[PDB]
Amino acid sequence: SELLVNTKSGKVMGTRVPVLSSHISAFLGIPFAEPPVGNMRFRRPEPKKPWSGVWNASTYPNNCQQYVDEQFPGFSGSEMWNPNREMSEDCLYLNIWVPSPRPKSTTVMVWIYGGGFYSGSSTLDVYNGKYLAYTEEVVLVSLSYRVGAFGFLALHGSQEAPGNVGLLDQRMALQWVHDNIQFFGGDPKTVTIFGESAGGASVGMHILSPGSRDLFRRAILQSGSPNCPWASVSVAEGRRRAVELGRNLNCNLNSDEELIHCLREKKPQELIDVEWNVLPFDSIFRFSFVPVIDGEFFPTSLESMLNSGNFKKTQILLGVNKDEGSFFLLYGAPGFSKDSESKISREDFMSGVKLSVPHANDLGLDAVTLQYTDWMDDNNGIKNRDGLDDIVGDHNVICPLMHFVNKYTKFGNGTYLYFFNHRASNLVWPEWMGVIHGYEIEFVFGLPLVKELNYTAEEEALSRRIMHYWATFAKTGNPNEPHSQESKWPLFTTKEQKFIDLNTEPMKVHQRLRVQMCVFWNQFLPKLLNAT
Amino acid sequence: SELLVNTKSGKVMGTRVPVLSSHISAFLGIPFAEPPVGNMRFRRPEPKKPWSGVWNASTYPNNCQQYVDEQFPGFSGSEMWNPNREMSEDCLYLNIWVPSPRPKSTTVMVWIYGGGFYSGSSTLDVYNGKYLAYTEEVVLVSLSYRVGAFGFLALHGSQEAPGNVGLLDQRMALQWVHDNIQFFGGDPKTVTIFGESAGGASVGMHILSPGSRDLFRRAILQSGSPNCPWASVSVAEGRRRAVELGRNLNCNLNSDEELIHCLREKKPQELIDVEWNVLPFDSIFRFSFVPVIDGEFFPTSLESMLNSGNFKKTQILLGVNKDEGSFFLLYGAPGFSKDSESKISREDFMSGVKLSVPHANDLGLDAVTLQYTDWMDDNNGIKNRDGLDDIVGDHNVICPLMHFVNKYTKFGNGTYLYFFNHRASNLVWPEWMGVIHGYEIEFVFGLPLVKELNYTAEEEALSRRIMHYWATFAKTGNPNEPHSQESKWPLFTTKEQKFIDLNTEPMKVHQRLRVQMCVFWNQFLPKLLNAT
Numbered sequence A, B: 001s002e003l004l005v006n007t008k009s010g011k012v013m014g015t016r017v018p019v020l021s022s023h024i025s026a027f028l029g030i031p032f033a034e035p036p037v038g039n040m041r042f043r044r045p046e047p048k049k050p051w052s053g054v055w056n057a058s059t060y061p062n063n064c065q066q067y068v069d070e071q072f073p074g075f076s077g078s079e080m081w082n083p084n085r086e087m088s089e090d091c092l093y094l095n096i097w098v099p100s101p102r103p104k105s106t107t108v109m110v111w112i113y114g115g116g117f118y119s120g121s122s123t124l125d126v127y128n129g130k131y132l133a134y135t136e137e138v139v140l141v142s143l144s145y146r147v148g149a150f151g152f153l154a155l156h157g158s159q160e161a162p163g164n165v166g167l168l169d170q171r172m173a174l175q176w177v178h179d180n181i182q183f184f185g186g187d188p189k190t191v192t193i194f195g196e197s198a199g200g201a202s203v204g205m206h207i208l209s210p211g212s213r214d215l216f217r218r219a220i221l222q223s224g225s226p227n228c229p230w231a232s233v234s235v236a237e238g239r240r241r242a243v244e245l246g247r248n249l250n251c252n253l254n255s256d257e258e259l260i261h262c263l264r265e266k267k268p269q270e271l272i273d274v275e276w277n278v279l280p281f282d283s284i285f286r287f288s289f290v291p292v293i294d295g296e297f298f299p300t301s302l303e304s305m306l307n308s309g310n311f312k313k314t315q316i317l318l319g320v321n322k323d324e325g326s327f328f329l330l331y332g333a334p335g336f337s338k339d340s341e342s343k344i345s346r347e348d349f350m351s352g353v354k355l356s357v358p359h360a361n362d363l364g365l366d367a368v369t370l371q372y373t374d375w376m377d378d379n380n381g382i383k384n385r386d387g388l389d390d391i392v393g394d395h396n397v398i399c400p401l402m403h404f405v406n407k408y409t410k411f412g413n414g415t416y417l418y419f420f421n422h423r424a425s426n427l428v429w430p431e432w433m434g435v436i437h438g439y440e441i442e443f444v445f446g447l448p449l450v451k452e453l454n455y456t457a458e459e460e461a462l463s464r465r466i467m468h469y470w471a472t473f474a475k476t477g478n479p480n481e482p483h484s485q486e487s488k489w490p491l492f493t494t495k496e497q498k499f500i501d502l503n504t505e506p507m508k509v510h511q512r513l514r515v516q517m518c519v520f521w522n523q524f525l526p527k528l529l530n531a532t
């Protein structure tokens, strides 16, 4: 039987699902950890102890407990990212799409969802793996992990809430795949982890963390990077927010044991209701419970590891979207509306600058402002909008990722960099928002191949071109098929720094993605804020 | 006679000079102060004691003791700036061109030479005033003042060497014009002072100084302004350079009397020969002995005075050239040469900005470098050269002037702003140097009118238009004749900030001359240097 598979933890029964006038096998909601429930909230995951009988792996599992975005109720553009399944702390499950008939020892890609480390689901419509698994004949795995305080509360010193456990949640799913993927046709020696936003930074953290390196072969990062200013926090700061979360619920605060114990008696949503109140500043693109640089998952500072070459040396394919930051301005900055062109007064631009670089002193705010303001036209509400759009995208995604791409490529065995700048013909968001953070995912996952979704012919062609790049890279370490006729995506090299546009037009090679702005973000401004 | 004039100090006898197939009157070498020699070296000028008989005022006077530029011996492009007659401390003379026949109470323009306060002469071929006085029917005066240590050695506290005496020289010539220009057909109620480089800052400094505000009606500043970073020093820095100048001549240093008595014993060129060894920094566009902010010529800081409106309220006309900095890099900065295009390596560019901003910490040099480097092309030697050229131009002339013009226009009674960017067809310097510091002077003074000088027909028109702009402004406060078909040079206003190009093509109006770079130079970099 194709759908009955005996794993190291027990038997599993999947389901035949249809894809594009064909079918493949799906195993949905396979447990890989013990439920982190009760006195195991905030604790490192423990391996799923084995079960008797047959797991019904035909339905998506629960979603992890997370903040639900209700800004625009019923709007598809926002709720495609919201939980589509009941929420529970019992969430550590994974999904598998296997081609039919089952391959022998074929390539495995493991999807890690974003959502800023406080949200995200493996069961979203847009992460439906059946299209990619079927089209590129790969075994496709959605893992899940604890987000928010449940996944990343960090009281360095405590063994009851040490931090990074949502990252260990993913490491443990990776280990599950290492021990079990062969039973589905997967080659555990040819496993590509990929992920977007917080998922891309996660990928980058498994590249960096020694405990994770040996559980996967290659790596893809989309709009995310380990060193992003939002992607981690120091031990002291994570202790602050953890204790501050307690104060916000009348938790006794003398000791970690008593603090932890209070927070474990709480209902999930009570933690979630106050989760955002622990941030140091009025922020945009900042999140309360993210990884901590602890000396265990992360041996030292992310930057010293990058200098020393202290990370996994492999091939990586990574990139960013044109307008990473627009979605965050819409939600968190004055002057932005989903229902107007969001032309931005000067006064609102000043406020958006403040909210966009939380940590900058006054001098740093003046530098940022100067760097992005056209002083022949400082009242042009569009240039003020796009300018602050660039600010958020450059500060939080593009420039952090270029720092990572340059540091990594000095030691890696091959880098491929892309600039995704197609705006979907069928987009539900306004034109000012541009190529939005997360909207390359639907092309990665083959959704433009569904005729009823009404993407254009050349959008289907772009999706197939992207899936193949991803898949060919996952098999071979190179997005291209060598000595084949299609134009060849070049290696990013230390010296020439090439990268490609990803869109419906023929390929274009460029060099030095956003150096001018990124020199500011990665070298000048850090020197400026450091000086006092 | 018409050439014999009884002044309040004695009779002078001028000479009849030809100009453009006509003739006018010239009174050369009229003395306006007592010769500041021996024991009156470094001291405030005293007014010329009256003489008996007829002063031969028919040949140019001596030039003040100055450093003579010898980098290009016999080369016309630099020789035209050097003394063209004997140098003497006995140099406090002025020259007057009067149209023939002698007008009744007409407009008076008093020229103030530049030269970084260490050099310059009233008697250069480009400062010949016969063309301007004849063509525009004005009475043209050119004064002189002590330069270098002789004029600006400052030991504040002392009345033997108090500083600024070169500015007082100018004032006393202005006062001589107020008292005797009526006898030459000049209207002492309608005197316009004008000058270039150090002369422009001098004009500007008289606007601010109270003891100078009544000796003229209105002001022209070319490529200089009072706040230029090379144009003044504190009393402490002046005293430091004065004591250090003594040290270089093993002068007694225990007291100002002892130090000054020692410096009055040395021959002029002994002082000159060490004058440059007192700068605090390896720098370009910096000069040893310049005006002091003493509390008396300037009652408070240049900035506070501009803020409180503590200056003369009238009409000013002012402007800059396109490539002010080129000349200073040629003489002082690596990779530059008079006989190559002077493509600049990244290395020489770094060395370049270090000499341009000698007062800057490392964060400041970084900011400058970030501000003028194209990081898509950081090794383009042309872009690096031009970049360095703009850094010197903007920092030393343009942006200092723009700060002055914005501050002045709040309180003034009318501002006119120019941007001179014609490159003379017969120029003897290389193309890379562009529109050079000082090279619109030949158009102000009508040199294109001389057929033998080999200008174009369109350069004569530009000079004729410039001269008429200058004269008309001096006579009325407005460069525009108020009917005059043409194209009217708009008033510069606080809000709209209009200026005009000066070149051979029809006048265009723009707004916010170099606002982008000047926000950096006037607002951000100073705040950075103060913060760190």
Ligand SMILES: O/N=C/c1nc(CCCCNc2c3c(nc4ccccc24)CCCC3)ccc1O
Binding pocket: A276, A277, A279, A283, A331, A332
């Ligand atoms: O961007 N949203 C902007 C935004 N929304 C809300 C509505 C949801 C309730 C709290 N929820 C969030 C909070 C904060 N930041 C959030 C970011 C995303 C989603 C909810 C947030 C920071 C301050 C504390 C509360 C409130 C404040 C906001 O500032």
Ligand SMILES: O/N=C/c1nc(CCCCNc2c3c(nc4ccccc24)CCCC3)ccc1O
Binding pocket: B069, B077, B078, B081, B114, B115, B116, B120, B196, B197, B283, B284, B285, B286, B287, B327, B328, B329, B331, B332, B436, B437, B438, B439
């Ligand atoms: O810190 N050191 C400061 C420094 N000083 C100089 C002046 C050198 C000779 C002046 N002679 C010239 C003048 C002018 N314009 C010129 C154009 C071309 C050539 C010579 C010119 C206009 C104003 C009057 C003098 C050069 C480089 C420096 O770096």
Ligand SMILES: O/N=C/c1nc(CCCCNc2c3c(nc4ccccc24)CCCC3)ccc1O
Binding pocket: B069, B276, B277, B283, B284, B331, B332, B333
């Ligand atoms: O331009 N600086 C570069 C420079 N030049 C020279 C020319 C020889 C005479 C010195 N005399 C001048 C000095 C300076 N600047 C000058 C500019 C024009 C003409 C003579 C200068 C500044 C530094 C000290 C002396 C020597 C040393 C230099 O280090």
Ligand SMILES: O/N=C\c1nc(CCCCNc2c3c(nc4ccccc24)CCCC3)ccc1O
Binding pocket: A069, A077, A078, A081, A114, A115, A116, A119, A196, A197, A283, A284, A285, A286, A327, A328, A329, A331, A332, A436, A437, A438, A439
């Ligand atoms: O700033 N504080 C944070 C913040 N939180 C929210 C609430 C969650 C909605 C995120 N849901 C979206 C996601 C992504 N892309 C989106 C594009 C458009 C609309 C929603 C998107 C990609 C990564 C996964 C989630 C909104 C705006 C914010 O800025």
Ligand SMILES: *[C@@H]1O[C@H](CO)[C@@H](O)[C@H](O)[C@H]1NC(C)=O
Binding pocket: A056, A058, A059
């Ligand atoms: C597994 O669950 C699905 C969903 O309800 C159902 O269709 C199927 O019959 C179940 N299988 C068994 C053996 O219970």
Ligand SMILES: *[C@@H]1O[C@H](CO)[C@@H](O)[C@H](O)[C@H]1NC(C)=O
Binding pocket: A412, A413, A414, A415
């Ligand atoms: C990767 O490593 C192999 C051998 O270890 C080497 O030959 C190859 O050139 C490397 N490729 C890149 C892109 O560094």
Ligand SMILES: *[C@@H]1O[C@H](CO)[C@@H](O)[C@H](O)[C@H]1NC(C)=O
Binding pocket: B056, B058, B059
């Ligand atoms: C001044 O005197 C006469 C005019 O009376 C003139 O010709 C002469 O050249 C002048 N003096 C000198 C030294 O040139």
Ligand SMILES: *[C@@H]1O[C@H](CO)[C@@H](O)[C@H](O)[C@H]1NC(C)=O
Binding pocket: B412, B413, B414
């Ligand atoms: C000041 O100038 C303005 C125009 O710039 C004009 O009203 C007048 O010339 C001056 N004002 C007074 C009160 O004299």
Ligand SMILES: [Cl-]
Binding pocket: B243, B253, B254, B255, B256, B259
């Ligand atoms: Cl002393």
